[PDB]
Design a protein around this ligand. Sequence first.
Ligand SMILES: *[C@@H]1O[C@H](CO)[C@@H](O[C@@H]2O[C@H](CO)[C@@H](O[C@@H]3O[C@H](CO[C@H]4O[C@H](CO[C@H]5O[C@H](CO)[C@@H](O)[C@H](O)[C@@H]5O[C@H]5O[C@H](CO)[C@@H](O)[C@H](O)[C@@H]5O)[C@@H](O)[C@H](O[C@H]5O[C@H](CO)[C@@H](O)[C@H](O)[C@@H]5O)[C@@H]4O)[C@@H](O)[C@H](O[C@H]4O[C@H](CO)[C@@H](O)[C@H](O)[C@@H]4O[C@H]4O[C@H](CO)[C@@H](O)[C@H](O)[C@@H]4O[C@H]4O[C@H](CO)[C@@H](O)[C@H](O)[C@@H]4O)[C@@H]3O)[C@H](O)[C@H]2NC(C)=O)[C@H](O)[C@H]1NC(C)=O
Ligand SMILES: *[C@@H]1O[C@H](CO)[C@@H](O[C@@H]2O[C@H](CO)[C@@H](O[C@@H]3O[C@H](CO[C@H]4O[C@H](CO)[C@@H](O)[C@H](O[C@H]5O[C@H](CO)[C@@H](O)[C@H](O)[C@@H]5O)[C@@H]4O)[C@@H](O)[C@H](O[C@H]4O[C@H](CO)[C@@H](O)[C@H](O)[C@@H]4O[C@H]4O[C@H](CO)[C@@H](O)[C@H](O)[C@@H]4O[C@H]4O[C@H](CO)[C@@H](O)[C@H](O)[C@@H]4O)[C@@H]3O)[C@H](O)[C@H]2NC(C)=O)[C@H](O)[C@H]1NC(C)=O
Ligand SMILES: *[C@@H]1O[C@H](CO)[C@@H](O[C@@H]2O[C@H](CO)[C@@H](O[C@@H]3O[C@H](CO)[C@@H](O)[C@H](O[C@H]4O[C@H](CO)[C@@H](O)[C@H](O)[C@@H]4O[C@H]4O[C@H](CO)[C@@H](O)[C@H](O)[C@@H]4O[C@H]4O[C@H](CO)[C@@H](O)[C@H](O)[C@@H]4O)[C@@H]3O)[C@H](O)[C@H]2NC(C)=O)[C@H](O)[C@H]1NC(C)=O
Ligand SMILES: OC[C@H]1O[C@@H](OC[C@H]2O[C@@H](O)[C@H](O)[C@@H](O)[C@H]2O)[C@H](O)[C@@H](O)[C@H]1O
Ligand SMILES: *[C@@H]1O[C@H](CO)[C@@H](O)[C@H](O)[C@H]1NC(C)=O
Ligand SMILES: *[C@@H]1O[C@H](CO)[C@@H](O)[C@H](O)[C@H]1NC(C)=O
Ligand SMILES: *[C@@H]1O[C@H](CO)[C@@H](O)[C@H](O)[C@H]1NC(C)=O
Ligand SMILES: *[C@@H]1O[C@H](CO)[C@@H](O)[C@H](O)[C@H]1NC(C)=O
Ligand SMILES: *[C@@H]1O[C@H](CO)[C@@H](O)[C@H](O)[C@H]1NC(C)=O
Ligand SMILES: [Cl-]
Length: 968
Amino acid sequence: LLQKYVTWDDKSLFINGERIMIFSGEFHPFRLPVKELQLDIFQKVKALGFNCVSFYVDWALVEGKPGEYRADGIFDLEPFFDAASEAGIYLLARPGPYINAESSGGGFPGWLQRVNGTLRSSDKAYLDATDNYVSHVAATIAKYQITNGGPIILYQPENEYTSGCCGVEFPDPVYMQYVEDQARNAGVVIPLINNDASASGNNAPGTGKGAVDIYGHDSYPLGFDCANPTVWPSGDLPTNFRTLHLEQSPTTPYAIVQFQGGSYDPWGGPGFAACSELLNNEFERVFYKNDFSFQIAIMNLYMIFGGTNWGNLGYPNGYTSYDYGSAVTESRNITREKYSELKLLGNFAKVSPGYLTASPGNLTTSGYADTTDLTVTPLLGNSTGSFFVVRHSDYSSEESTSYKLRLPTSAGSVTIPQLGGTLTLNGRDSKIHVTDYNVSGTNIIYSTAEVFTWKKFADGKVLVLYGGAGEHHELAISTKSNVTVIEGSESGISSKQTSSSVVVGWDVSTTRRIIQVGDLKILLLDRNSAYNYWVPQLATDGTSPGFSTPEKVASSIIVKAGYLVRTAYLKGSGLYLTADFNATTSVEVIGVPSTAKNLFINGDKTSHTVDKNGIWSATVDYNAPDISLPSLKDLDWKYVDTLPEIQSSYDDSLWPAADLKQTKNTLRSLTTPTSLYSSDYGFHTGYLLYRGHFTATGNESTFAIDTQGGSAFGSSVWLNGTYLGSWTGLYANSDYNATYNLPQLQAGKTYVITVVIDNMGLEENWTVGEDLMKTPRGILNFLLAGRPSSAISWKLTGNLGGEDYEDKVRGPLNEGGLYAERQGFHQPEPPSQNWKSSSPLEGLSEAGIGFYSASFDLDLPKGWDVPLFLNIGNSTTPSPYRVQVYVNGYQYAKYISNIGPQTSFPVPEGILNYRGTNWLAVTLWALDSAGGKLESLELSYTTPVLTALGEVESVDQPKYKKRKGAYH
Ligand SMILES: *[C@@H]1O[C@H](CO)[C@@H](O[C@@H]2O[C@H](CO)[C@@H](O[C@@H]3O[C@H](CO[C@H]4O[C@H](CO[C@H]5O[C@H](CO)[C@@H](O)[C@H](O)[C@@H]5O[C@H]5O[C@H](CO)[C@@H](O)[C@H](O)[C@@H]5O)[C@@H](O)[C@H](O[C@H]5O[C@H](CO)[C@@H](O)[C@H](O)[C@@H]5O)[C@@H]4O)[C@@H](O)[C@H](O[C@H]4O[C@H](CO)[C@@H](O)[C@H](O)[C@@H]4O[C@H]4O[C@H](CO)[C@@H](O)[C@H](O)[C@@H]4O[C@H]4O[C@H](CO)[C@@H](O)[C@H](O)[C@@H]4O)[C@@H]3O)[C@H](O)[C@H]2NC(C)=O)[C@H](O)[C@H]1NC(C)=O
Ligand SMILES: *[C@@H]1O[C@H](CO)[C@@H](O[C@@H]2O[C@H](CO)[C@@H](O[C@@H]3O[C@H](CO[C@H]4O[C@H](CO)[C@@H](O)[C@H](O[C@H]5O[C@H](CO)[C@@H](O)[C@H](O)[C@@H]5O)[C@@H]4O)[C@@H](O)[C@H](O[C@H]4O[C@H](CO)[C@@H](O)[C@H](O)[C@@H]4O[C@H]4O[C@H](CO)[C@@H](O)[C@H](O)[C@@H]4O[C@H]4O[C@H](CO)[C@@H](O)[C@H](O)[C@@H]4O)[C@@H]3O)[C@H](O)[C@H]2NC(C)=O)[C@H](O)[C@H]1NC(C)=O
Ligand SMILES: *[C@@H]1O[C@H](CO)[C@@H](O[C@@H]2O[C@H](CO)[C@@H](O[C@@H]3O[C@H](CO)[C@@H](O)[C@H](O[C@H]4O[C@H](CO)[C@@H](O)[C@H](O)[C@@H]4O[C@H]4O[C@H](CO)[C@@H](O)[C@H](O)[C@@H]4O[C@H]4O[C@H](CO)[C@@H](O)[C@H](O)[C@@H]4O)[C@@H]3O)[C@H](O)[C@H]2NC(C)=O)[C@H](O)[C@H]1NC(C)=O
Ligand SMILES: OC[C@H]1O[C@@H](OC[C@H]2O[C@@H](O)[C@H](O)[C@@H](O)[C@H]2O)[C@H](O)[C@@H](O)[C@H]1O
Ligand SMILES: *[C@@H]1O[C@H](CO)[C@@H](O)[C@H](O)[C@H]1NC(C)=O
Ligand SMILES: *[C@@H]1O[C@H](CO)[C@@H](O)[C@H](O)[C@H]1NC(C)=O
Ligand SMILES: *[C@@H]1O[C@H](CO)[C@@H](O)[C@H](O)[C@H]1NC(C)=O
Ligand SMILES: *[C@@H]1O[C@H](CO)[C@@H](O)[C@H](O)[C@H]1NC(C)=O
Ligand SMILES: *[C@@H]1O[C@H](CO)[C@@H](O)[C@H](O)[C@H]1NC(C)=O
Ligand SMILES: [Cl-]
């Protein structure tokens, strides 16, 4: 339409004139702000057989100050894009402005609470507020389009523009057209794709103004309830998705822009390990092959890698972790079985172009298989091949089911298995059987066992097939040649020859078999052996694999290894692999080019033997060195009181006054004399403090207050130095009405109520019209009994400078309003040399907030990827306390003792310096009159990985420097 690099028809996208199945994974650059680890994720995604990544940009992080767009350093998108290019990974860009994404404000900066107009509408006040952001971020995206040699192939304007309310004319075509035009005006020429929250047809081609180029929708069919991970409720497997696609957008490829790849988890919830159990390998093979049943051509898993809600970037209902139960864990490991299972399907689709050209039919409980207990959806191709997706009719069934099939082929319609026995489907599993499947000229008439991959080498073809344990399988090949078993035993290998074919039957075994039929070798594996196979692209012009183009796809090799294979390249007589290892691993290479004489692994020449079938074998030894980690409790901890506000000497005269008589928040009108909404004064993140001055009459009894900080928030209140009490918090409370009883006050004297409130982040804005992101934070109501409310004059603070935020390197959200934070003491090398010697393990003996500082050295060995975790103990029911931990200035843990569930906090290399000094800054807020302390505090590690990754550069860690604008 506007360029010729990326086109489409009713079946699929074309990239440079060639069909491709887009298999993508969601990865957010702002949730992993170390550029070398971004590359790691991209390489792990490519090893799945994927070819794309989808990403959000968080507006709140890059325009904290209205009018000042900053996407530099750790927020720089350019290294993220170059890393995609280096890995051979295309990109779907989704910069919002609204992104939801369990992020504070759903991506909107806190200053949108002052916008006089409906958010996500055509009100000019909202649209003008978006202009500066979109023109900058879309210009950067434009520069890296595929039209300009970049990796970016698709662009998503808005996010799930699907439901409206409250007087909004939904859907508004003027709005979506303006959003679309903003991108085009910034120079975006690539196709636009939307993500309708459900398959409702919004903004599809044919809808007139505001229509996108490719209609996409989203789907999370198993819900977000990770508490019952084995429960698959009745009817939750979609069946009508193709039907709705043809009704809603028959001219564009079938696209799910966010398909479930995990789940979010709230404060107090069951934990992300439970989420990984619900969205496990069984879920993937049943539900993802079900999407293939609808001939899905663009498929994106939200999330493929989740990362971390560091520096308060997350929304109020969620906590520090965003592991998401995804295929790649928060700490970047790929141990979960769901990673290996998904690799099998990604590789299937990477080499099966016949899938895109078949004619999908309707699902059947009869006609293909001999039992109504199975459902079979056919995708019928002519000479291009056919595909049959088999599953249990009741998709939740754990029953083992025997069956036979009738499949049409070029050689007649066959009743399979021909040579005796039956096929089996065990429990929550799904198969894609193939017919007339083309292996570069050799035609597989049929195979019941699923295809992992196939390649054409200089000296013959290889095909890799697998089945699950206990299964009997069958294939047939168009050939005059006979079948011979070249690896393994003939026992269990039955066969029959005809004039134009050979039929072969086999039982799945833990022992591999290789059979040979003319110039085709076929590997017959079990699913668990296949989990250890990889298909890196073989580079000849350099060391990078390049994008997944037909030519580079065809020039790939097959490697059996362990934990991970990243890349392969050929250079003279040298075949080079880059790979990672979590144990001593035997490596086999199939498809070694004839010009290759030596094997290098991670640059190191490695001995190899060649067996009778031309397969190179080698061994990679794993010997972790001593991983020495200091004891956190033995460090030289230094303490300073970070609530000096509750001493009578404190002088708040430099504090902003909360003296606005009219709020700019259109959602909730004032129920107090002045606005006590933090965002009216430019304070959107972290702990908020309010100070209320009054002159006592001496008749004061009680002080009531309604605090609001979002779900799981807490608040504490003092009268001068007297602790009045705390709201200790519940996930179910986003506000709370306390009543406090005051001591006997001295008539004519001045008092100050100090109030501390945990701001858990700003709310999302999912429903257009509702403006829920404007939900304020701070104090909503108060009553000083017997006195008019004008008796109290308030001041407040958030992070120092508010929207004129101090830390331009770490961004607008990282730090909140505590004294120690205002002064910048949470950064490396604070002025702690004259502080008191006290540990957070000793803690506090009265309600308050303390700040603890210490450094520690690491000297971890080069060439190892070692995930490190901070651990805060909770072996027994604790008293109510709140903890924030800054690692070299970066906040990487928020902890609520009484709500949970997170006790283990990963912190990535780059934020941590593995061969240098590191700084911990811990805040400890005790919401109890007897104080509080940490039970324990420990640095731990999980399995070290022998890695190919390059040196991880430390991000910028600005050290403490005295701040002019502070209040002291
Ligand atoms: C280095 O990197 C490696 C990756 O490259 C990494 O390896 C991976 O590790 C993870 C674990 O971290 C593996 O995932 C788990 O796998 C478990 C094992 O089952 C799988 O494998 C067996 C085959 O096992 C045999 O073969 C292997 C060799 O391949 C041997 O090592 C084994 O010892 C065993 O060998 C014997 O048998 C062989 C015969 O095959 C013999 O030849 C041999 O000589 C030996 O005698 C398969 O059979 C399994 O498939 C079956 O079950 C699955 C799912 O259950 C079905 O889908 C499938 O169709 C089959 O029926 C399977 O493939 C899994 O048990 C384990 O599953 C649990 O955890 C996940 C969450 O992590 C859940 O999704 C899942 O539901 C299970 O959760 C329950 O149980 C766990 C407890 O384990 C609880 O945590 C959880 O709360 C939940 O509890 C509930 O249900 C329970 C029911 O089980 C119940 O008991 C409870 O009470 C409760 O109600 C998980 O998937 C992964 O496979 C490895 N990947 C690879 C490629 O190897 C390695 O760890 C790294 N190393 C280090 C040090 O870091
Ligand atoms: C891949 O990435 C993943 C995400 O990054 C990562 O997963 C995370 O891994 C960390 C580190 O292991 C996990 O934190 C730990 O979790 C432990 C509690 O969970 C266990 O026990 C449950 C009991 O019902 C099991 O059900 C549960 O299994 C589940 O979770 C698995 C995740 O690994 C998942 O695979 C399974 O499928 C399953 O669903 C799990 O086994 C927790 O015990 C541990 O706490 C301690 O360890 C710390 C570090 O050593 C200590 O600092 C801390 O105090 C605890 O120590 C105590 O622990 C032991 C047992 O008591 C003792 O040996 C220790 O000495 C110590 O003992 C003290 O405390 C006792 C109190 O009970 C006391 O009685 C003792 O006398 C003594 O005082 C830690 O929090 C994290 O949960 C994982 N996150 C997620 C999202 O899954 C994974 O590791 C990565 N993998 C690789 C290879 O890199
Ligand atoms: C250290 O260890 C200690 C001691 O073991 C840990 O303390 C425990 O922490 C638990 C987790 O927070 C806590 O359980 C919670 O208690 C409250 C009751 O006061 C309860 O509300 C919680 O249950 C709901 O909330 C969680 C999410 O937090 C949901 O996952 C759960 O399914 C429940 O969901 C319902 O309520 C939500 C609240 O609004 C709803 O949004 C949700 O949809 C669902 O709605 C229903 O319930 C309402 C009630 O009927 C109803 O009106 C509504 O419409 C729906 O029916 C959860 O049980 C333990 O109490 C606590 N134990 C002790 C002894 O203190 C501590 O966490 C540990 N620390 C760390 C760091 O790990
Ligand atoms: O939780 C991860 C993402 O949730 C997405 O939104 C919700 C989801 O809910 C259901 O209505 C439906 O099954 C599905 O189609 C979706 O609309 C957001 O798009 C995303 O930003 C994350 O919040
Ligand atoms: C099989 O693939 C080759 C390309 O390697 C192609 O030339 C041939 O036409 C294909 N066969 C069919 C039936 O599509
Ligand atoms: C309470 O604190 C203020 C300073 O915040 C101080 O000037 C005032 O005298 C104190 N009132 C009493 C009764 O001690
Ligand atoms: C927004 O501006 C309109 C038009 O000038 C005005 O009528 C309305 O009262 C304003 N609302 C707020 C909250 O400032
Ligand atoms: C305040 O004044 C009332 C009389 O108006 C009296 O009954 C009450 O005891 C006084 N309260 C306190 C706390 O002194
Ligand atoms: C607190 O009281 C206010 C004022 O009536 C009310 O509107 C709000 O809903 C109450 N909050 C809770 C959590 O009960
Ligand atoms: Cl200050």
